Design a protein around this nucleic acid. Structure first.
Length: 52
DNA sequence: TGCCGAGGCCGCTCAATTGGTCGTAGACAGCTCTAGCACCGCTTAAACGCACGTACGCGCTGTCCCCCGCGTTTTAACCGCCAAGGGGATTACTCCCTAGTCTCCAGGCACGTGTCAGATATATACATCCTGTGCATGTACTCGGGATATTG
């Protein structure tokens, strides 16, 4: 019980790391969506919404 | 000679762009939502990733041995051109019809919930189907000789 610190702010990102995990699991994916692979995927989505 | 005829420079007037100013109307940004339900933190008992000789499979390697590449030039018409003709694509106008606006109006159905079932998942036992292996011939192939078709 020490408050909470969202996975977005821990990563350094403005896109929602939690929401995207829960979207990847229950996509047409196989049965194991590692958590470090929702951070290298909020990033390589937010990067277009900068570069575009 | 002549004359003049033909000749070469400079203000109106109109017609697109260009940029400016007016005022007004939804639509954007933002607030407070409040509200709630997802994110998180916190455990657990959990699956599945992963760092790591060795059998050994095959990727790569040192040879010789030839066609298709490589080189030439004649020619052959392919491809380009220009110029003319005809029309059909184009332009500008007038009449016309509906596209579009708004407004009223209903119920069709897409929306939503309320219950809880036939569905399919998961286990254990298991038999069976299917793979990997080993194994004859049968053909589709490459060659040689002659007939038919077609180019020049």
């Amino acid at each position: 019980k020490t408050k909470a610190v969202s996975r977005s702010q821990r990563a350094g990102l403005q896109f929602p790391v939690g929401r995207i995990h829960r979207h990847l699991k229950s996509r047409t994916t196989s049965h194991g969506r590692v958590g470090a692979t929702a951070a290298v995927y909020s990033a390589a989505i937010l990067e277009y919404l900068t570069a575009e």
